[PDB]
Amino acid sequence: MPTLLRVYIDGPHGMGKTTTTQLLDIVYVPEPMTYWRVLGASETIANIYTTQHRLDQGEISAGDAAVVMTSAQITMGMPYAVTDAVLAPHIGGEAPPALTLIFDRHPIAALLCYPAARYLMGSMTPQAVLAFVALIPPTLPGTNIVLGALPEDRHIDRLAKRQRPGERLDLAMLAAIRRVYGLLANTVRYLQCGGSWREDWGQLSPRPHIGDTLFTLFRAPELLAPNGDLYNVFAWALDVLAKRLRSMHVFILDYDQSPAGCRDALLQLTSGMVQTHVTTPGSIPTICDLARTFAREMGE
């Protein structure tokens, strides 16, 4: 069968991502803005930022913020969820690629990365973050995740330039979110280096120290038994997290440059990403139509 290349450009918002991918037998699946602002619900992004603002002003409580916050993360990952779902069966085993799919963000941003950041923000229960993790679909072969690198003040400047409507410059949420992708990038090398959280978990009391991995966020008092132990339910959700992330291929793009440069770099990492065969002759065309119809309908 012919081969495919799936590339998910991911990282914190405000790093110039959509811009540089649009500057790129290659389809680009955008961010489903229409689905957030209109299809799934009314102005999901506004809701997120507003709510946290009410929590920051104490106009509402950590728990009401959690439910609203929780209910929104659902609307945000839905389009990505279904795409991976319908896409999954066509992807074959790892292997010029007959089709290159550039996606704007992977599902883990919705089922892991943003949820965690909001936890880090006192707006999402760690119990909920782990519920989402538990739902992270299996990791198809050839899943290349590009995460971005960019100096803080530079990223603050950028965050400032363009924001979806309803947003708010939230410098904490920036640091919260920059923290997560940083930890996530660390977890992957850890898992890949042979690290076992169960074996290293006691330390929280050639590879990253589990203190610099995503595992360190779940030493959360609400996840532990009166004697300090993690409840098994939760220990298992970390076996899923471990399971899902270890197979991903993470590629770093330095965003501290010009779109032309970022673009030129993005295409550059491509030389080492992993391709896979498709399942049917007609997989490529079906995939091509899905990615174009996804774009057409949800990209504003």
222 closest CA partner among 233, 214, 211:
233
> Burial letters for 35-63: b for 16+ Cβ neighbours within 10 Å, e otherwise?
bbbeebbeebbbbbbebbeebbeeeeeee
Please select the residue that binds ligand BTD; options are 5, 29, 45, 145, rule is CB under 6 A: 45
Q: In angstroms, rounded to a whole number, what is the distance separating the alpha carbons of residues 26 and 18?
A: 16
Q: Which does 110 bind (CB under 5 to 8 A by kind): ligand BTD, a copy of itself, none?
A: ligand BTD
CA distance 231 to 223: 6
94 part of the active site: no
**C-alpha–C-alpha distance, residues 276 and 141, integer Å:** 7
CA distance 285 to 271: 24
Is residue 57 helix, strand or coil? coil
Q: How is residue 161 written in tokens? A: 């330039």
Is 80 among the residues that bind ligand BTD (CB under 6 A)?
Answer: yes
Smallest distance from a copy of itself to CB 74, Å: 5
Which range touches ligand BTD (CB under 6 A), out of 70-78, 126-134, 229-237, 249-257? Answer: 70-78
In the bound complex, what is the minimum distance in angstroms from residue 129's beta carbon to a copy of itself? 10
Quick one: 49 or 95, whose CB is closer to ligand BTD? 49
**Residue 105 touches which of a copy of itself, ligand BTD, none (CB < 5 to 8 A by kind)?**
ligand BTD
Give the footprint of ligand BTD on residues 145-184 (CB under 6 A).
Answer: 164, 167
127 appears as a binding residue in the annotation: no
| Tokens representing residue 75 in the block | 């609307």
- Return binding residues for substrate: 49, 73, 164
User: Which residues participate in catalysis according to the annotation?
Assistant: 31
- Residues forming contacts to ligand BTD in the complex (CB under 6 A) are 13, 31, 45, 48, 73, 76-77, 80, 105, 107, 109-110, 114, 164, 167
